[PDB]
Symmetry: C3
Subunit: 314 residues, 3 copies
């Protein structure tokens, strides 16, 4: 596949800053090198230089609003620039608030995209239902058209125009959903497969329904926003909000392998990797390695094996 | 749901005494507080004061018979008292021998109850087939009507009257069944889903069949006797008889979530939690936390989220 | 069942020598004693005394060819001798290169056998596609009739005559397949269930298809070549080539339990156990214990329980 790597070292969508070390540790793990080792065409668009906004007081309870709204504004333009180049944007990020810009810029070039959200959380809190005030747990609320008229005018986000409908998104891996968020889920009819549905149906069936749900009417570009805490912390411990009983390594790879096989993947997000939170150097390596594996699976690496179109027996 | 918490700090159903610290550590973990945080009506019936029986020599091979038969005699009356109050009895116990009193007192008020037994073992040894002599591995033998005429007159249990038929009980999670016990299983036609059936069908199907098996003829009150060693020791290490290859955290929560959803749960047992056996303080916290999670799932906590009947967008 | 234990302490099929300690640690774990504790008829054929071949330079890239071809030549005759005795050969080995002799000797007495290969790898590299030069990752290439005319004349293997067709073998657990190997897989139409198919179908379905695939036309003797790295390294860490995201303990036991139940098992291989690679003594015990469990499952030990044909209630 043909990639367009974008490093997004941002963390003001939440409290812990070590998250902006993601683009760095993932690249050192050899991500670019490994993609090239596959049938991949890769162009590194560099790490976006996010400028600090000293004067950025809370909007009510919402923290670092201008800083966050700016980082997504900047990211949105990069993602659109890479999608204009006929490449699949790979946003190596910090916190999940960057999804607002990622999905926004992608939808500018492909308004009919579908979103698959792998995460332990729904991240659909509005500035008024949030209790933490952290914008990384509110990205979907800014993107959903149906919630337009319920999101206040928060400093830094005037440029935002909801681009996805409640019916063009699927959640996979949920296990820590706030009360208001759940109300949103059932009220707007959002499709999701929490860990309970995964336990009941199996990831094989969960992926069949997910893909049918989004591509059954007609094929459309796929945006995969992957929060590494969607996977169990025994796989990705170095993340800010781990929740036990998560998706397995195998399930993580199954999800992505199936997405790749659709040939419809066009936008990907690898988020919330925070090395600074690894209890040990191995926990850091375990988290980074899992993130790389999931990434490579999105672009072709198959557990059954891969081979070029040639005669190996010669 | 409406609870009736009963602390049962008893351990003479087996060798290790640290098991009577269960009611204590579970309460300190905030169990009562967490239930109230949910749509739960809770009444703490206190910890039953089990009096020591100094003169209690073995009945043949059976150990602490009078002490065990008395603790279940006492528990049975409490469980019936709470069921008379129109509440779901939550027996926070020590060893599983207390199930004899738990199921007995529950059946006094609801003779038509069905039992779901989550455990690594069948606990169906009779005083004559047991090899350890520990009564916590014999509770079902005292309750099954079909085995009446095969259980000797053991000091301390004259008050017992078998209350459940071999066909009103389902086992989930089996992986360490004694030879005599297995003979009992196949001979009395007891329905069970060992770890092999779980591997074959998946916990989703296992729960569908379990619930159909017990409620298909007609709806009837459900008694869930949960031995924490039913789950793999990587989740509940602090328990006296761990067996590898157990139910996962997710499967544990799936089982209970499905039980709750039946609206038929009326009696629950959380057994065999022994803090004193945790290799480290974290193993203790891991065991206690898992037990609390399983408990909350029995009363409504859903992994997909929970919300009150109000308008959150306001 | 009736066993014929053969110890094969060989390791020249790969770099690390600690692998020849397998027959020793497995026996000390009480394997023979445990089999006898079951309805098993066991005869220990001893540990094959592999003589060192000082003069054994590489054949091109292939290492220790004469040493490896000799060890399998010797093993093949033992396996045939045990199969002549109407016993199920249990080859406790070193590295997987010994499979060439194991399957070869078994097929001499039962030409119509079927092979089930549990492994993280396909071990189907030819002397020309291999990149490591280690013969333990090439055993199947020597056995497949279809690849005859593609395997060079390697010193030590002239005695070999391919005995199995590409259609009489099934792979379970694959997750690290080389490019040439994959080309072989798809070209010869080899049936396999990588970790992706296991994730999709579940081990229950995977075993149903595996067994139907091999025994549907007609019942035929089963040869199970089990590489302990087929299971996840959280279960069998002490092995030379671990790959994350492997089969679970439960899945491992399910596979074997189902094989046993066919009553068709006639040859088994327990390979790649290397104690010297255990980070700690517990990792060694974890690996050894898992290997023993898998072995006992092949011969009857059932997780639901086992009982003799007698009346236990008496
Ligand atoms: N729901 C919590 C947790 C947020 C988790 C955000 B995430 O998924 O991006 O890590 C909050 O609203 O603050
Ligand atoms: N079957 C063994 C083990 C007993 C386990 C009892 B339990 O499940 O309550 O922990 C015995 O009869 O002693
Ligand atoms: N495919 C690699 C790894 C070999 C693994 C061999 B085995 O499965 O027997 O441990 C090689 O050809 O050298
Ligand atoms: Mn998120
Ligand atoms: Mn999250
Ligand atoms: Mn029990
Ligand atoms: Mn038990
Ligand atoms: Mn192998
Ligand atoms: Mn292998």
């Amino acid at each position: 596949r043909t990639i367009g790597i974008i490093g997004a070292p941002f963390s003001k969508g939440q409290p812990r800053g070590g998250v902006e070390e993601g683009p760095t540790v993932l690249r050192k793990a050899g991500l670019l090198e490994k993609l090239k080792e596959q049938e991949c065409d890769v162009k590194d668009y560099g790490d976006l230089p996010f400028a600090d906004i000293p004067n950025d007081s809370p909007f009510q309870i919402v923290k670092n609003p201008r800083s966050v709204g700016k980082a997504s504004e900047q990211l949105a333009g990069k993602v659109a620039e890479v999608k204009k180049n006929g490449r699949i944007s790979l946003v190596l990020g910090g916190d999940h608030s960057l999804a607002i810009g990622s999905i926004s810029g992608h939808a500018r070039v492909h308004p009919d995209l579908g979103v698959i959200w792998v995460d332990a959380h729904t991240d659909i809190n509005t500035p008024l239902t949030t209790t933490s005030g952290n914008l990384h747990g509110q990205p979907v609320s800014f993107l959903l058209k149906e919630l337009k008229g319920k999101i206040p005018d928060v400093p830094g986000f005037s440029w935002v125009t909801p681009c996805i409908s409640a019916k063009d998104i699927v959640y996979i891996g949920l296990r820590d959903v706030n009360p208001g968020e759940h109300y949103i889920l059932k009220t707007l009819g959002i499709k999701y497969f929490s860990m309970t549905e995964v336990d009941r149906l199996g990831i094989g069936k969960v992926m069949e329904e997910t893909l049918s749900y989004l591509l059954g009417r007609k094929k459309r570009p796929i945006h995969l926003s992957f929060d590494v805490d969607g996977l169990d912390p025994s796989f990705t411990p170095a993340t800010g909000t781990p929740v036990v009983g998560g998706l397995t390594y195998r399930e993580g790879l199954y999800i992505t392998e199936e997405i790749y096989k659709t040939g419809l993947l066009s936008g990907l997000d690898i988020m919330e990797v925070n090395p600074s939170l690894g209890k040990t150097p191995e926990e850091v390596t375990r988290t980074v390695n899992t993130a790389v594996a999931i990434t490579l699976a999105c672009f072709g690496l198959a557990r059954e094996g891969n081979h070029k179109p040639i005669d190996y027996l010669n």
